[model samples]
Target chain A: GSRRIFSGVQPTSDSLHLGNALGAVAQWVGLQDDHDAFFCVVDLHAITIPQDPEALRRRTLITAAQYLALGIDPGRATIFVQSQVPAHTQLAWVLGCFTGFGQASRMTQFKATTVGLFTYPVLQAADVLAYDTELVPVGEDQRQHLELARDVAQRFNSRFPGTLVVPDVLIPKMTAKIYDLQDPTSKMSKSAGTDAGLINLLDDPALSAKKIRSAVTDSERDIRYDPDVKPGVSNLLNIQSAVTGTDIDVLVDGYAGHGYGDLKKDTAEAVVEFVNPIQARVDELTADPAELEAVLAAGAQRAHDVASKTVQRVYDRLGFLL
Target chain B: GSRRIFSGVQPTSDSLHLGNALGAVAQWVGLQDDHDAFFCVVDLHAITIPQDPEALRRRTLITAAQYLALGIDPGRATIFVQSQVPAHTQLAWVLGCFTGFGQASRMTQFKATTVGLFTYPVLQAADVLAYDTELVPVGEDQRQHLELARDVAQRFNSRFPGTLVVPDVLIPKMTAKIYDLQDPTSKMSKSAGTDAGLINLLDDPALSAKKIRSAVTDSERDIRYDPDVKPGVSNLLNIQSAVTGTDIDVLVDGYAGHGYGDLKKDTAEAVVEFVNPIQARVDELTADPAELEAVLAAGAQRAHDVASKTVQRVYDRLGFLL
Candidate 1:
């Protein structure tokens, strides 16, 4: 009934940041409308580095709820955990076999790290391939990985001949380009700072409210839209407009006769409005683990129906005794 | 149920050599008598290089029949295809996370092969670990692979706190130690050749008979059992002894006065006798593909019952979402 799509988010944190909430998940949420989306908590890939099991388990569930709360409809999209689906690893083995050792060795993360770090790109390829996937949402830095998947698909097809569909790189669309409230110059993500500047989507609304009040804005009299001239003011406006669905022109006009404090206050209220229902959904999903579990279980089965079919065709082409 | 043990033979060729049939598979067969066993046609591991799916599929089934003929009872050992059990690759993912990149890179085969060659050892580790196998039969060239398995198992237990059994390297035993009838000095296989010295297990009985009769023996055919002096005659002695289920002492004594032609004649008969029932059984198994398929399906199911429990414990310890 729909086109197939696959994307995974690692359950590496207790809660997702606004970047993932407003950017990645939002992109995937849009896909659920026309595509048979497979959004996964990539817990298998998360173990490339060390992790605490209790925290990891908690995060895996929370990530699923976050996606669900962020609007990946369970009925529309095949939402599940990566480790929940065995075919991921099943196809990963075939991809690794088709892949060259030197090819895997050059993966930048494993330059001086664990085998998981080196081999995970193949696993990622499997994540896409198991469903006869048509498109993948990989950004610039991850283009190498997408290329590897394309190369692997060719290797498999050359031998098995049309057993795999070589998926193309999909350029992810941008929406709310949110930045750090305290350091409006940098992105609102945790690759750099401690938990200070990052806006956690699952934390209390008041904490975000506090951070919003203390946001970095320049000494400008008028509220006009210019990122280079006033990055802080532009960031607040972007957040407010993106979440509220009001155009930046409309948002800046509405705040024409306002101070930075009023602007930050409105932005904070808009953000809290955005996250309150998501946090509530997470609370609801948490209270009923069975319901969440049922969703993942159903998704796992749905995933198997698609993934196992692809792996079977792949195994047959690879000459594996079915 | 017997205690669980796993040994996967790559479906790389249509027929297994006496080295594998007698040595490696022999070890598993012996252990199978006491401990539970899982004999797998590792069609999954066969593709580190290249393959023809039709050939691979044929060879995979033939390999299973050969094992059945060689005496790995399906009733005792869980005889299945490796790809038939998804958990083999499933747990391989977990072990990869534990394996060091440098350590995996150091594998001699991977120094110049596909990622499959480098990674199949981890899949082999998965083949063993998925069942919580207590021991593995690994000899000279493959000892390093076994060590890697051991290292990974330890790494897993160290982190997961005792979910896997670090298998011991079980020394494989010998029977015929069959050599090339033509050369009488070199080993009987190449898994990786054939012709002059090799006697393929699948060739016609008359063909093998002719080769055995054409074997190289000595001028001093006074029928003395001296390997150092008479390598050719000694090799014939080994072949006849193994096939006839006779000891070397008894065989040598029985032919104390016979000439080289007599020895060759007897050895040829022994080989024809050796392969007749195996070939017939293979013909029978091939004739009934569904029965063989049923046997494998049940074996995969049986393997899953034990493997899933271990993996559940492993998944639980590793913090994977159930």
Candidate 2:
């Protein structure tokens, strides 16, 4: 039987970087074919940090647009914004009732911050459980969140048997690790002080090509994929292999005896070829914002069909007269 | 101009006691005629404490029935359950984002309880703010919760002007203070170790009359309205005065020459006359629960009309794409 999978991307940045495309969304794109998928733009989580309203709105649309541009077919899977579904917050409140104050206060994310930050993991729990998601694909940082959701499900289901699906974390077996262009050690992140090392999917094709061309490499040109020593050049190879769907060994054999200039030039050209079509698609979607909104609205309507029923069952089990 | 008012009672018990009737619900009943009233049975808050599923559902329906039986006309005022309106939790999550962690953690209710208990004040804030409520009639303990809502509204409205109405607290000018029959000094509460001291509106009329007869009084034969020296007698007078719609002074004048036995007989008879009709009404409403449920559902529909618009305006100002 195909398992249902849930995953989300925070709409906190204007554009997704190469690391996101290669590492996270690409895995989601692969799983959508074999799994029942719910891909969400997590704008509610984005509010854990104070955000500019207009920027947040634009980023939410762009985030959904990027998901479509990167090959997540809304027709094949459910794609929606988090806030559009009231069950996210509704079930969060119910889950919070069963969660201990001491336990929630002890979460690593519960520093001196907004209540939203402290309570967000429970909301994340609600996000998965509201859809009865069997699998949640998340980063290492969110492992504790999934565990919390499972614990809550165990407790809730003990009293109201089978009200929630205790979800397991889905870890991709073949994740392509992409790193910074300049440092090569740190992962590409929007929080980085400098955007020079980042390859944005929505960046101008020429700009992205320039960043790829200027990527750092070792003084010795072995053209090998040894991340420990030749991290900078190895990162370029990793990115190019992921973008072109080629094996690293095959690319390394193709690049044998070639100078570092050829490595950077071809990698740059491959990256340009990759982002050009996506950038064009994003522009086409953004050209008429209403159409993009309609797409998201339709997804929300579809998502509501599943989510509302789950919440209704939960409410009945919890003794709320719905 | 008349102000829109909001208040709610947790459906934690089977019946509202003397303190709730004379001290709380009576004032709400009075305000309904002159104000745009929204009365809610806060079943969401009830989940903060673990409850028997069937008992909670029965109590939720009973709570709303009692409101109508106690003179809150659903035709003039909106009476509904908290969980029925999705806007309550929706606005709560939005308000939680604006509420500070340290600020909410410092609340008196946030000591070692569930996350829902610690965060319920924010939900209470949302309950009122979602309706643009101008006035909230609350007890002294709820002063802090109302203040938190005002603070959140101030901060949110500063960024998005007129997004929320900063509500004011309405303290009733003439609340009839009722105390326990067994211990006149202690306020009437459901947590009392013994039910003998409490007078539940839904209790049998004969049983309530016997409780009123067993009520402790002084040795003096002259019945006065002085609460300090004659607290038990004064409490009985207060209860009878509020229930019978007579003034305390007028009752005292009429009882100046009566013995303690006569005063007890009259007060008990007054209480029986008062509760008989209400109990009949509650029983009638409960006999056909579908009709009671229809009334509550209609009120929820009416409440959603106002609350959804407020949340939409707030979400629009917060830059959520509708």
Candidate 3:
């Protein structure tokens, strides 16, 4: 009876870190109850770059397991690997004919990677629209791409009304913009040169604690949420607030008299407690490869049903036989 | 076993004419024993221009029946409709990505038609390459397109060898240059504006006789096969020699004492006798739509089996999973 939501994360990395968890996974978890949510570990997108086949295959399963562990309920949200649906590629081909090479080249994210990367946004648009999704929850980094998706949807709808629903972006107002610990000015990124800046969900707890302790901070001893003067300390506070669900004002006041060392230790403890259950669940899921595969198989079938319908409609509009 | 041959004709017109019959279809008939052959009625290529749907559908069936009636042995050579195989369009999409826009634009035949007409050659190339065809019999008008197909095959083979055999063009010398009936210098074509210059295989026998009786000729007609001085009379002699399997020199001497009226009468009789059996076979085939549809369905299945193997090899070569 309700509108559906669809979002995807690429299975290009070995592990999704705290930033991905709080920024994307946590938001997906919140939407599972109100919407018929579909989340995908987009393996097809990962191949835009040259990837080791064995590593990619392993990471695909791991990413799906991580999504399940992070409160993306399998019963409520459809979760799958993107490549399992043949229609995704088929529809993407049809849409590519309509998409201008110049328009696709203009995407800044695509410009940053290979030519194969330039086509990724179109495929992403196909993934979202294929399910007739009404809403897309995207972070700042993905906002431009989501806008492209909306433009493509409007174009398709204008040419073929009642065939595709134009989706709107659902950017939450309280979005916590997480910054890199090592380089406080830059947004936290998987492309960060070293693991020292990231707190991965699957990292050794002791190593994660060590990274937090050694996190760069200003010489100022007074603890406060002043990003302009003490960005390093402010970033930690932001992460602590995101994970523990505490107000930044309340956190700053509570730590008013504490030293940076006490703040880091407490923040580390909060993060550890937050990630413990997720890590445990991931371990349990991965131990039985058969169970993980079964979930992916069911999710792929559900995804195909939705995607194939969209592809069929596209074929009809283009005067191609279904 | 000898290599297979595959080629197609676009049924963009209502009927096959004398030039198309002797030039293209006759070669297809001859290839049945030496090579596994596949002949297709390419209705898909007809949509390059706006088409009346009913006319296109009717012409497709009529063209298939004409191929059978012209001794193309459907029992030996696979004959089907091009649009029935989905993989043809699918493979064309992949080949298009690799095809340079400038290169596709430079095709001589494409330069003569609309931009949509330009893409038809790529589809033609796919039709040949999909079946791993080793030989493609073509007229001089189509030789340029077949060269492009060979270029595509070479590029594909070099990048992904052992998958596709670059087909050689089998240009029959006798049918290579059928000229227009009215303008002896020009090539015979369906796109030619005048019906007076064409000879439809299914034309009424009496009407065809009348057309031949009124065919153009010069006053200086000494019944010699001299193209430069007596182009009209020479053209008639060439047609008579071709139909009767007699040398042009011998036919010209035989017609030296006779008048142009006597030559026209005998040539018309020979043309009618050649087309009579073909016309009867066409009528018989078209009367049974069920049998024709079944033949086309089986032909499509066989074509798919050949094409899918080539497409899968291409997918693997491009580092894509099939």
Candidate 4:
């Protein structure tokens, strides 16, 4: 009965990286109290490309575990795998008919991915609106997709009134873009080949620290946060400040007299410290498979309750009976 | 278990016409005893176009009732409404992925219809293969679509081994193409605007008689079975023979000294007598909504049991769980 919030993360990879932590998952966790949240491990979206079946199954569970460990309370917020709710795909087929090939093709996020990947946004729209979601927290890359969702919702509402509640985006301004450490121009992506650029949340602390030590920075020795002249050093400083909840200006002034190695070492230490508890919690949760399964089963049931109701409403509007 | 046969008719109209009755539904009833037949009233396919919701809902029930009245025995074959089984649309999504845009575009039956109607065949392919059907009974006009179904099935099997059974066309040559009475040049279609040219199996006897009386013919007016020179009279004779189950050769000899009026009267009498029982059965069945609903429920359960197995197999192949 409350205003619902829905968002999904693709379980295409083994771990949620530092970029996902600071960018998406952190935002999802923060919304748990204010909004009745629904977080999904979107494995269905991941199959847009050819995937190793075993790896996909493992990733789906791991992603769900990460959400559970990262302050997403199973009791408060609904967290489940996307494919568990069959209605998401069912509604997507109905939405696809209304969506023109040209219009779906024009989605920028879909264009960046494969054609199967491209059509996934329609499913995402279905996921959000299926539960009468009020707000969708999205990154800059997905802004156009969210807009398309709104367009689809409007069309659905016009065709079948009092059915879907058209949702709005809850875009956070400050941490919207998390760039890759190796290439500061590009966004942090698992598709990026350079391992040193990403800090995987589930990676071994020592390995993560090693990757951070080997990270690329400009030749300029001055460690002060000057993004224009020293992007790599500035990138590390930003990560440190964001994760540690320390002021950037104070951290920059404090590190003014420090050398580049000291900066990288301190940055790596801070990242290691930040990710240590999350990794521990994930390990702790994974150690008890029964508990993890129960949590997920409960989450999936909650998700189904909401999703099934929405699907029933959708079927009614579409002239389809149970 | 046994080899399955899946077939469906769109609930796009209030009643099944003579073309649909003889060409499609009659064949479906005949298949019930031979194979594990699954017949459906495909409401999902009907929504490809702009549909009046109430009309679609009413037509869906009417179509299912007509299937039962026409001898699609629930005990022998599974007769269900497509919308009741979510797998029909769900599998369509997967088949759409394997189907190339160019390949789908090349379907001649689809080429003749609007874009909404164009995608119907791929959905049909999904319908048949979803139940692992081995044979599909189709009319001459639907042969191209059946070919597409085979292509899609083979393509899927090639990608995922032993998953789908590629069904072959079971076109009965004698009943393949029933021509339009007014224009013997074209196939009879409900979409065609000539009310007098097409016969409705559910129409009143008076209306059926009127249509036969007004049937176009040449001035020579000899009731001979010469298709090339006297196609109109020949077509009437063929219809008469088909309805009465009398040999066309025998009818031709009998009409050697007869006029066109006599032929028309006899054809009308045969048609009226043929449809009178079917119409009466439909009326008797419609009188009790509870019986119709129970039959549909049983049919839906049977359809769900079969289709869900194939869908589960597909999901497992694509790395999904129960």
Ranking by DockQ: 2, 1, 4, 3
Model 3: runs farther than 4 Å from truth?
Answer: A18-20, A109-118, A172-199, A205-238, A247-267, A274-276, B1-74, B77-289, B300-322
Clashing pairs in 4: none
How much is A111 displaced in model 4, in angstroms? 4.6
Interface RMSD of each: 1.2, 1.1, 6.4, 4.0
Displacement of the residue B193 alpha carbon in candidate 1, Å:
4.8
What is candidate 4's TM-score against the reference? 0.89
- Report the Cα lDDT for residue B107, model 1: 83
Instruction: Write model 1 residue lDDT over B182-301, tens digit each, in one string.
Output: 776665665424465667677788987888888888888677667668888887887677667788888888887778899989888987888888889888988888877887889889
Predicted complexes: DockQ each? 0.64, 0.66, 0.11, 0.33
What interface-residue Cα RMSD does candidate 2 give after superposition? 1.1
Score chain B of each candidate by TM-score.
0.86, 0.91, 0.92, 0.92
**Number of the top DockQ candidate:** 2
Over 4 Å off, model 2: A173-187, A205-241, A247-270, B173-186, B209-237, B248-269
What DockQ would candidate 4 receive versus the native complex?
0.33
Query: Could you give the candidate ranking by lDDT, starting with the highest?
Result: 2, 1, 4, 3
Model 4: how far residue B194 lies from native, Å: 4.7
Compared with the true structure, the alpha-carbon lDDT of candidate 4 equals: 0.78
Q: B170-286 in candidate 4: lDDT tens per residue?
A: 876545766677887677787778677888888888898898888888899577767778767877887788777788889988988778999999999999998888888888777
The residue pairs in collision within model 2 are: none
C-alpha TM-scores of all predictions: 0.86, 0.89, 0.69, 0.89
Would candidate 3 be rated incorrect, acceptable, medium or high by CAPRI criteria?
Answer: incorrect
Candidate 3 lDDT for residue A44: 72
- lDDT string for model 2 (A108-129, tens) is 7673488888899899999999
Q: Write the per-residue lDDT of candidate 3 for residues B1-322, one digit (tens) a residue.
A: 2678887777777788777787788788878877899898876676666555567777888888888888787678898777666567656655554455667767786452332354556668888888888888877789888887788778656656776678899987656766677787787788779778777889877777677777778896478876768766776776677667788888877786788988888888988887788788888877878777878888888887877777767655554322
